[PDB]
Design a protein around this nucleic acid. Structure first.
Ligand SMILES: [Zn+2]
Ligand SMILES: [Zn+2]
Lengths: 124, 126
DNA sequence: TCAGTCTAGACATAC
DNA sequence: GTATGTCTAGACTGA
């Protein structure tokens, strides 16, 4: 696929194996969804410009808050921040949504923001 | 822990080997047992499989929207899956089958419930 | 609580 | 329609 490869172009920790195929799936899932809501552009933008003051990139939130990609389950913001920002990221307890983020996972709205540049990592 | 009832029932034609396939049939039985447990039809299943008496009662399972049943990662028709597991491993499709007038909830009568009593169906050469 | 399993229903196809 | 495979939210389940 197109943009998927581009977005894949950005990422870190080079964790190939089945994690490589998974990372691809996870990116495709997201693209499929942003496409529908016409937010793909603002996502590519955010990724390539590392510009924090970008708009929120939103995905629907599930009842328990988790997202499944393939057979694995996790928190969305944790999955995508670990993708494009911190490959070593461990849990959502290391993540702090900034104040400009309106749909932070921590707010429990109907939509969750996964813009990797809307969260900072806390040295806990 | 996978209840002896399942081990016992597996005994009546596990599923013509094939390592992975073997574990599938267990999943398939595990799934069936769980549902019959909740509706108290277990013993009735034990009975029919062990005695092979066609006069056993209907062993009923909820029907899903499309009529298919998923076990592990495979999908298929309920009666087909259990008739192939305990009677005809050769069984191919739901057409090689036909309920016996006596089966209240045969698959073909599309009711809220589906009978998976393997002894309520007969095989046909199409 | 927290993390992993399981599957009906929703899709997307192809006659 | 009927037939069939893929994916995942929500349900479930121990630790
Ligand atoms: Zn945001
Ligand atoms: Zn019957």
């Amino acid at each position: 696929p197109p943009i998927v490869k581009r977005l894949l172009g950005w990422k870190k920790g080079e964790q190939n194996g089945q994690e490589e195929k998974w990372c691809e799936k996870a990116v495709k899932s997201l693209v499929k969804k942003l496409k529908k809501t016409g937010q793909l552009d603002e996502l590519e933008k955010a990724i390539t410009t590392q510009n924090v003051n970008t708009k929120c990139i939103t995905i629907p939130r599930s009842l328990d808050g988790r997202l499944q990609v393939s057979h694995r389950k996790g928190l969305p913001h944790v999955i995508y921040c670990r993708l494009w920002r911190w490959p070593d990221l461990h849990s959502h307890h290391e993540l702090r949504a900034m104040e400009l983020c309106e749909f932070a996972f921590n707010m429990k709205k109907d939509e969750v923001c996964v813009n990797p540049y809307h969260y900072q990592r806390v040295e806990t």
